[PDB]
Structure formats: structure tokens, C-alpha cells
Coordinates of C-alpha atoms and ligand atoms in Angstrom, one line a residue:
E1 CA 10.4 -9.9 17.8
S2 CA 6.7 -10.1 16.6
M3 CA 6.3 -12.2 13.4
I4 CA 3.1 -13.3 11.6
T5 CA 2.3 -17.0 11.8
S6 CA -1.0 -17.1 9.9
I7 CA -3.7 -15.2 8.1
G8 CA -7.4 -15.8 8.9
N9 CA -10.4 -16.0 6.7
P10 CA -11.3 -12.9 4.8
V11 CA -14.4 -10.7 5.2
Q12 CA -15.9 -9.2 2.0
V13 CA -17.0 -5.6 2.6
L14 CA -18.1 -4.7 -0.9
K15 CA -18.0 -5.9 -4.5
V16 CA -17.8 -3.4 -7.4
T17 CA -17.2 -3.6 -11.1
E18 CA -13.7 -2.0 -11.2
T19 CA -11.2 -4.8 -11.3
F20 CA -8.3 -2.7 -9.9
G21 CA -8.4 -0.1 -7.2
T22 CA -7.6 0.7 -3.5
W23 CA -9.6 1.2 -0.4
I24 CA -7.8 2.8 2.6
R25 CA -8.6 3.8 6.1
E26 CA -6.6 6.1 8.4
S27 CA -3.8 4.3 10.2
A28 CA -3.0 6.7 13.0
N29 CA -4.7 6.9 16.4
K30 CA -7.5 9.2 15.3
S31 CA -11.0 7.6 15.5
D32 CA -11.6 8.4 11.8
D33 CA -14.4 6.6 10.0
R34 CA -13.5 7.7 6.5
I35 CA -12.7 5.4 3.7
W36 CA -10.8 6.6 0.6
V37 CA -11.0 4.8 -2.8
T38 CA -9.3 5.1 -6.1
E39 CA -10.1 3.0 -9.2
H40 CA -8.1 1.9 -12.2
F41 CA -4.4 2.4 -12.7
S42 CA -4.3 6.2 -13.2
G43 CA -6.4 9.2 -12.4
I44 CA -6.7 12.5 -10.5
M45 CA -9.7 11.8 -8.3
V46 CA -10.3 10.0 -5.0
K47 CA -13.7 9.0 -3.7
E48 CA -14.1 9.9 0.0
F49 CA -16.7 8.0 1.9
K50 CA -17.8 9.3 5.3
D51 CA -17.9 5.8 6.9
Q52 CA -18.5 2.1 6.0
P53 CA -22.3 2.6 5.7
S54 CA -21.7 5.3 3.1
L55 CA -19.4 3.0 1.2
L56 CA -22.1 0.4 1.0
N57 CA -24.6 3.1 0.0
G58 CA -22.4 4.4 -2.8
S59 CA -22.4 7.9 -1.2
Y60 CA -19.1 9.8 -1.6
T61 CA -17.5 13.1 -2.4
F62 CA -14.9 13.5 -5.0
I63 CA -11.4 14.8 -4.0
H64 CA -9.4 16.4 -6.9
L65 CA -5.7 15.7 -6.4
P66 CA -2.8 18.1 -7.3
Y67 CA -1.1 15.5 -9.5
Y68 CA -2.3 12.3 -11.2
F69 CA -1.7 9.1 -9.3
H70 CA -0.5 5.8 -10.8
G71 CA -1.2 2.4 -9.3
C72 CA -2.9 1.0 -6.3
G73 CA -0.1 1.4 -3.6
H74 CA -1.2 4.6 -1.8
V75 CA -1.6 4.9 2.0
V76 CA -3.2 7.3 4.4
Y77 CA -1.3 8.5 7.5
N78 CA -2.4 11.3 9.8
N79 CA -4.9 12.8 7.4
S80 CA -2.5 12.8 4.4
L81 CA -2.6 10.6 1.3
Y82 CA 0.8 9.4 0.2
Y83 CA 0.9 8.3 -3.5
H84 CA 2.9 7.8 -6.6
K85 CA 2.8 10.7 -9.1
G86 CA 2.3 8.8 -12.4
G87 CA 5.2 9.0 -14.9
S88 CA 7.7 10.3 -12.4
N89 CA 9.9 9.0 -9.6
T90 CA 8.0 11.4 -7.3
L91 CA 5.9 10.5 -4.3
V92 CA 3.2 13.0 -3.2
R93 CA 1.9 13.8 0.3
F94 CA -1.5 15.5 0.1
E95 CA -3.1 16.8 3.2
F96 CA -6.9 16.2 3.0
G97 CA -7.8 19.1 5.3
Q98 CA -5.6 22.0 4.1
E99 CA -5.5 20.6 0.5
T100 CA -1.7 21.3 0.3
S101 CA 1.0 19.0 -0.9
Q102 CA 4.7 18.1 -0.7
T103 CA 6.8 15.9 -3.0
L104 CA 9.7 13.5 -2.6
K105 CA 11.9 12.1 -5.4
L106 CA 13.5 8.7 -5.2
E107 CA 16.3 8.9 -7.7
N108 CA 17.2 5.2 -8.1
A109 CA 13.7 3.8 -8.5
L110 CA 12.0 2.2 -11.5
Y111 CA 8.9 4.3 -12.4
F112 CA 8.0 3.8 -16.1
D113 CA 8.2 1.6 -19.2
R114 CA 6.3 -1.2 -17.5
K115 CA 9.4 -2.1 -15.3
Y116 CA 7.2 -2.6 -12.3
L117 CA 7.8 -3.5 -8.6
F118 CA 4.7 -5.7 -8.8
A119 CA 3.7 -6.5 -12.3
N120 CA 0.4 -8.1 -11.2
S121 CA -0.9 -4.7 -10.2
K122 CA 1.2 -2.4 -12.3
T123 CA 2.7 -1.1 -9.1
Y124 CA 5.9 1.0 -9.1
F125 CA 5.8 2.2 -5.5
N126 CA 4.0 0.7 -2.5
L127 CA 3.7 3.2 0.3
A128 CA 3.0 1.7 3.7
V129 CA 2.8 2.6 7.4
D130 CA 3.1 0.4 10.4
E131 CA 4.1 0.4 14.1
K132 CA 7.8 0.9 13.2
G133 CA 7.7 3.5 10.4
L134 CA 6.5 5.2 7.3
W135 CA 7.8 3.2 4.3
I136 CA 8.2 3.2 0.5
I137 CA 8.7 -0.2 -1.2
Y138 CA 10.1 0.2 -4.7
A139 CA 12.4 -1.5 -7.2
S140 CA 16.0 -0.6 -8.1
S141 CA 16.8 1.2 -11.4
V142 CA 20.4 0.4 -10.8
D143 CA 20.0 -3.4 -11.4
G144 CA 16.4 -3.4 -12.6
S145 CA 15.5 -6.1 -10.1
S146 CA 16.1 -5.6 -6.4
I147 CA 13.3 -4.7 -4.0
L148 CA 14.3 -1.7 -1.9
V149 CA 12.6 -0.1 1.0
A150 CA 12.9 3.5 2.1
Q151 CA 12.3 4.4 5.7
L152 CA 11.0 8.0 5.9
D153 CA 11.0 10.7 8.5
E154 CA 7.3 11.7 8.5
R155 CA 8.2 15.2 9.8
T156 CA 10.2 16.2 6.7
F157 CA 8.9 13.7 4.1
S158 CA 12.4 12.6 3.4
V159 CA 14.3 9.3 3.4
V160 CA 16.5 8.4 6.4
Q161 CA 17.5 4.8 5.5
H162 CA 17.6 2.9 2.3
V163 CA 17.2 -0.9 2.9
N164 CA 18.2 -3.3 0.1
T165 CA 16.3 -6.6 0.6
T166 CA 18.3 -8.1 -2.3
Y167 CA 15.1 -10.0 -3.3
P168 CA 14.3 -10.0 -7.0
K169 CA 11.0 -8.3 -8.0
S170 CA 10.4 -11.1 -10.5
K171 CA 9.6 -13.4 -7.5
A172 CA 7.2 -11.0 -5.9
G173 CA 3.4 -10.8 -6.3
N174 CA 2.8 -8.1 -3.8
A175 CA 3.9 -7.2 -0.2
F176 CA 2.9 -5.6 3.1
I177 CA 4.8 -4.4 6.2
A178 CA 3.8 -5.2 9.8
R179 CA 5.7 -4.6 13.0
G180 CA 8.8 -3.7 11.1
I181 CA 8.8 -6.9 8.9
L182 CA 8.3 -6.8 5.1
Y183 CA 6.3 -9.8 3.9
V184 CA 6.4 -10.6 0.2
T185 CA 3.9 -12.9 -1.6
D186 CA 4.7 -15.4 -4.4
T187 CA 3.9 -14.5 -8.0
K188 CA 0.4 -16.0 -7.7
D189 CA -0.4 -13.9 -4.6
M190 CA -1.4 -17.0 -2.7
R191 CA 1.3 -17.4 -0.1
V192 CA 3.9 -15.3 1.8
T193 CA 7.3 -16.8 0.9
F194 CA 9.8 -14.2 1.8
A195 CA 10.3 -11.8 4.7
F196 CA 12.8 -9.2 5.8
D197 CA 13.5 -7.5 9.1
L198 CA 13.7 -3.9 7.8
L199 CA 15.4 -2.2 10.8
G200 CA 17.6 -5.2 11.6
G201 CA 18.8 -5.4 8.0
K202 CA 18.4 -9.2 7.5
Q203 CA 16.2 -11.7 5.8
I204 CA 14.0 -13.9 8.0
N205 CA 12.2 -17.1 7.2
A206 CA 8.6 -16.9 6.4
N207 CA 6.3 -19.3 4.6
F208 CA 2.6 -19.2 5.2
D209 CA -0.7 -19.1 3.3
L210 CA -2.3 -15.9 2.5
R211 CA -5.5 -16.7 0.6
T212 CA -7.2 -19.4 -1.5
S213 CA -8.7 -17.2 -4.1
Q214 CA -7.0 -16.9 -7.5
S215 CA -8.7 -13.5 -8.4
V216 CA -6.3 -10.9 -9.5
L217 CA -4.9 -8.9 -6.5
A218 CA -4.7 -5.2 -7.0
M219 CA -3.8 -4.0 -3.5
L220 CA -2.5 -5.6 -0.3
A221 CA -1.9 -3.5 2.8
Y222 CA -1.6 -3.9 6.6
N223 CA -3.3 -1.3 8.7
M224 CA -1.8 -1.0 12.2
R225 CA -5.0 0.6 13.6
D226 CA -6.9 -2.8 13.5
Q227 CA -4.0 -5.2 12.6
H228 CA -5.9 -6.4 9.5
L229 CA -4.8 -6.8 5.9
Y230 CA -6.9 -4.8 3.5
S231 CA -7.1 -5.9 -0.1
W232 CA -8.8 -5.3 -3.5
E233 CA -9.2 -8.5 -5.4
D234 CA -10.9 -8.3 -8.8
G235 CA -13.4 -5.7 -7.5
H236 CA -13.8 -7.3 -4.1
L237 CA -12.9 -5.2 -1.1
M238 CA -11.7 -7.6 1.6
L239 CA -10.2 -7.6 5.1
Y240 CA -8.1 -10.4 6.7
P241 CA -7.2 -11.0 10.3
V242 CA -3.6 -11.7 11.1
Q243 CA -2.2 -13.8 13.9
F244 CA 1.1 -12.8 15.4
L245 CA 3.6 -14.9 17.5
Ligands
NAG301 C1 -28.8 4.5 0.4 O1 -29.2 4.3 -0.9 C2 -30.7 4.4 -1.1 C3 -31.0 4.1 -2.5 O2 -31.2 5.2 -3.3 C4 -31.1 5.8 -0.7 O3 -32.5 5.9 -0.7 C5 -30.6 6.2 0.7 O4 -30.9 7.6 1.0 C6 -29.1 6.0 0.8 N1 -28.6 6.3 2.1 C7 -28.0 7.4 2.5 C8 -27.9 8.5 1.3 O5 -27.6 7.7 3.6
NAG302 C1 -0.1 14.9 12.4 O1 -0.6 16.1 11.8 C2 -0.8 17.1 12.8 C3 -1.3 18.3 12.1 O2 -0.7 18.5 10.8 C4 0.5 17.4 13.6 O3 0.2 18.3 14.6 C5 1.1 16.1 14.1 O4 2.4 16.4 14.7 C6 1.2 15.1 13.1 N1 1.7 13.8 13.6 C7 1.0 13.1 14.5 C8 1.7 11.8 14.9 O5 -0.1 13.4 14.9
NAG303 C1 21.1 -3.9 -4.0 O1 21.6 -5.2 -4.0 C2 21.7 -5.8 -5.3 C3 22.1 -7.2 -5.2 O2 23.4 -7.4 -4.5 C4 22.8 -4.9 -6.1 O3 22.9 -5.5 -7.4 C5 22.3 -3.5 -6.2 O4 23.3 -2.7 -6.8 C6 22.0 -3.0 -4.8 N1 21.5 -1.6 -4.8 C7 20.6 -1.1 -5.6 C8 20.2 0.3 -5.4 O5 20.0 -1.9 -6.3
CA304 CA1 10.8 -6.2 -16.5
CA305 CA1 10.7 -12.9 -15.4
NA306 NA1 -16.7 3.1 -5.8
NA307 NA1 -3.5 -20.8 -0.8
NA308 NA1 -3.8 -14.0 -7.9
NA309 NA1 1.1 -4.1 -1.1

């Protein structure tokens, strides 16, 4: 029903020295100013910034996680961080307020040995939230290739539908999900060249430009709160507008 037709010019919010990382805002209807950051491909700490002025000021508080993260594909939904427990096929839900956590295993997902979903960012699992669901993008350990998406029930942190896109990870740079549609970039992370209607179970044509920069892309995520794409590009924290049709 609602497909992206183009991506606007990016805004640079901050530049830092860490080539790879993520920056994340709350996605739910909450009026939350906080920004969460991780750096590098593994660790057990998150930097919490009160708001965007604090981000620009370098003023944060460390959050110690219950399990090490891997990668740059985490997401925040309803005051919980959803992330990949490094070296396992386990995803973690960590509630920021109560500091409790729950775990979910995806048994037929690649998760080690550099058999990545997105090689460009060493991503095994890309967690995402949009208007239509809470999602995990991953790659099949049955065939070593196919991009799969799990639809979760947020109330039980469990999978309710497994979607096989049939698209080979070798052709994917990165991806995001918006209004129920998976969008996958080319291997250079410059254009979106594949899309899939997740709940309808079918591929849909998509071919549109994403960005002109060639800097390495660590993270790419749609936030339904503001309908922007958030990215981390060679240490540059960027936001892009998106145009729907
Ligand atoms: C922003 O950074 C400057 C540089 O040290 C500092 O003086 C100022 O207090 C910071 N703003 C805060 C902490 O709100
Ligand atoms: C969010 O979390 C709160 C507290 O854990 C809970 O009451 C609520 O049902 C959750 N979901 C939404 C959509 O707020
Ligand atoms: C997904 O589809 C591919 C291509 O048809 C197939 O090889 C694979 O077994 C399917 N399921 C999984 C979990 O990969
Ligand atoms: Ca491989
Ligand atoms: Ca190859
Ligand atoms: Na930082
Ligand atoms: Na381009
Ligand atoms: Na690139
Ligand atoms: Na992504």
C-alpha cells in the first residue's frame, strides 16, 4: 500500500572517530529525547545520552549490559534494547528501567564464523521496528544464503511468522523495514535494489537511490517515530528523510 519512492538529502548530526557503531532513538509513541550509542563490533557497554544537545556535548552515562553485543543492528522499542548476544544465535531484550532481560533463540540462523547477513558491517542479526511489527532480519543456516525475517510478538518476545525472502545475502549491503516492506541495498550500499512485502509474502519491485557517499555503512535503520532513516557511516551519524507514495 505505502511504498518508498525516494530518499532525501542526509543531515549530519555528529562525527566521531569510531568507524563502526550505532545510534538509536526510541521508536514508540513516548516523547523520549534519549539517544543510545554503541561503538565497534563487540562490547558490553552502551552510552546513553539525555538528548541531542548532550550527544553533541559528549555527555553520557554508561549502561552495562547483561550479555555482550555483537554488531550494529540493535533497535530500541518501548524502553527496551533488542540486540544480538555475540557468539550465539540468541537475541536479548534489555529493559532500560528495570535492568532486567529476556532471551530468544533463532535456531536456523547464521551467527558465527564470519558467515554474515551483511558482511559490510559484520552484521548477523538486524533487529527493526516499524508501523507493522517488531522484526529480526537474519540469514539462513540451512542454505547459508537466504535472507529471512522473523515477525515477533512483542508481548512474549517470540516468533510468530518466519518469512523467507529467498534473496541471497551475497547481494545485500544492508536493509531497513518501513510500513511492512523490507528494502535491501546493493553491495555498495548506494541504492535500494530489492524489496519484499513481509506480511503479503511476495517480492515487490524497488529500485531507487539511497546515498551518494561511498563511506562504509555500519548501520541503517528506519524509525517510525519520525519516518527518517538513521545511519552510521564511517563515524558520521546521519539522518535521511524518506518520501512515500
Ligand atoms: C559542553 O562541553 C563544554 C566543554 O567542556 C562544557 O563546558 C559544558 O558544560 C558542556 N555542557 C554540558 C555538560 O551540558
Ligand atoms: C510497553 O511497556 C510497558 C511497561 O513495560 C507496558 O505497560 C506496555 O504494554 C508496553 N507496550 C506498549 C505498546 O506500551
Ligand atoms: C528459504 O528458501 C531457500 C530458497 O528456496 C531455501 O533453499 C531454504 O531452504 C528456505 N528456508 C531456509 C530456512 O533457508
Ligand atoms: Ca560467506
Ligand atoms: Ca560472494
Ligand atoms: Na560517543
Ligand atoms: Na548513489
Ligand atoms: Na559503502
Ligand atoms: Na539495517
